[model samples]
Target: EWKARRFWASVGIHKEEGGWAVLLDERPLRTPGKQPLRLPTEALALAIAEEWQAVQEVIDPNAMPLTRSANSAIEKVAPQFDAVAAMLGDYGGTDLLSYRADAPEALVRAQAEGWDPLIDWAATELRAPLRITHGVIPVPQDPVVLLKLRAEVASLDPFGLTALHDLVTLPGSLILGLAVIRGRIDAPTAHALSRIDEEFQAERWGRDEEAEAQAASRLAAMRDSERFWHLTR
Candidate 1:
């Protein structure tokens, strides 16, 4: 008896030449772009499989964050590592940490408390210091600083790069992305730190249920990416 293809019947893992694959039945699966989905780590393969196996009668790709990230690594990211590195470096140039509230003394202190240590850590750890200012004016970062940040982005493999990009893109902060990868801060805290200004405004004004729900969803995605980072590593 046949119903639907289910598109996927079974999920398994197989050792490939250099790594592992989340096998569909006995055949190794390829990403939508037709690239073989081989991961350098078995743990990541298992995590990807877990996402597939969790499916019941129907499959939902949206539910599979790790698997989606894996596919993005293979298709969108791996082939253009330089572009991603340069993009993230651009983020460093106009990082959220670089812009501060000019007035509102309380908000100023909050930004310093949440963001200053990370900026300092970038200098001490990455040997590249960034500049800060109090407005939307684009501050020019030292060429050495942005170059160093680009190198850091280039240093990660595809899996790490995909996950790190998730963190970087959301907060729009390169140092924050580096912080999460380097164990400088946990994912939840990083999420909060990035949205400090928004959260502060919410505190002062009020909260909306729908907006809060969307915010939670975004945070959950980042947390998922964070979890995938460790598994992929």
Candidate 2:
């Protein structure tokens, strides 16, 4: 949907009661739900201010990912922080890194090379030693480890959790999500690692234009999520 034309001249950042906020003219930005768009830092508020200041004659929601994410943090994630955290934490049970293909030696090798180190990292660093398995059967993860993962998810504030939701769900791996947010891996590397299987299939069976386009869009979102996470910090 097209927003009404920009009515304000200057965009600025200022401190609010709870945190920093972006202001246009004399009005501070608010969520669609009318909640104050409270950001954790001036840096993030300045980033959001730039998004608003860059707008042309009309407002384009699609052009302002940082603003939209901040809105989501206030309107959506804050209201149900625990539920959202739990939902993302549950990805630990069936994390993508824990699954491997049984057939095709080349594919197996590729998965091992791409996934094993992250699994090892999770085991040692995150203390969530998720188990590995071949084929479609579900492999069980340790309950204690799951608690550790859940605790990690619970550690984030509402805005952080909001960014994490896309980071985890888009790529189908909590480990990759946490790895990126925790600075263990960069978004480009995490995105490529998450696509190892799909890339392998494209190499063998040829790429589907529709699927490839969708994957590209998803990668863009993942990169945005990484940026959003940093802003929250």
Candidate 3:
């Protein structure tokens, strides 16, 4: 649908009794469910208002991801925390970190180099170690390990968990998400780690500019989500 554009004359962010609120035309902005859009930090609230202010002829909600994330938490996830928790928790049992690329010693080494330390960190920090194996064969993960990892994923409040959900789902890697959450890896390095095989493939052939642009977009998403999570914190 080509949505009609409704332009707001004024947009601002201010401290709110809740946390912070984005004000459009000096009124508090509400989510799709009509709940006041209160974000945990002034930076995040301001960022969301920037998203609103950027809209002109048309309102592209896709352009306002952090806003949508806040709305999702306020209207949806907050109402049923267990559902969202379970959604992300289930990823740990069969995460990308537990799978390895067979053949090509170089790619195998790359996966090990980027992936093994995460398994170690999960063991030491999150108390949830995982076993890695070649290819997509189902490897048995300790039930306790998955539960502990899920517990860690659930530790974040709704907002941070929302970002962590992005982190996990974007790459299909719970270890990568947990690594970001635990401060073991920054967004850039983590993004590079997530694209190890892709990068290897690109090197094998010639780089495709179009694919590179898509990759750049995904990289921005990872970076932006991480930044969004930090601002909320």
What is the TM-score of each predicted model, taking all chains together?
0.92, 0.97, 0.88
lDDT of each: 0.85, 0.91, 0.83
| 141-164 per-residue lDDT for model 3 (tens digits) | 888988987888777798888788
* RMSD vs true structure, all candidates: 2.2, 1.2, 2.4
lDDT of 3 at 196: 86
Of 1 and 2, which scores higher on lDDT?
A: 2
Model 3: CA > 4 A from native: 1-7, 56-58, 208-214
lDDT (C-alpha) at residue 187 in model 3: 77
* TM-score of predicted structure 2: 0.97
Q: Could you tell me which 10 consecutive residues in candidate 2 have the lowest summed lDDT?
A: 1-10
Ordered from best to worst lDDT, the candidate numbers read 2, 1, 3
- Alpha-carbon runs more than 4 Å astray in model 2: 1-3
156-229 per-residue lDDT for model 2 (tens digits): 98989988998899899999999999899988898899999999999998998998998999989988889999
**Model 1 stretches with alpha carbons more than 4 Å out:** 1-10
- Candidate 1 per-residue lDDT, tens place, 1-233, comes to 24323557778898878789888677776787787888979999988888887777676778888888888888888889889877876887888888999868999999999999998999999997888998777878898888888899988988889889878888778888889988999788888999889888889989878878877987888898788788988
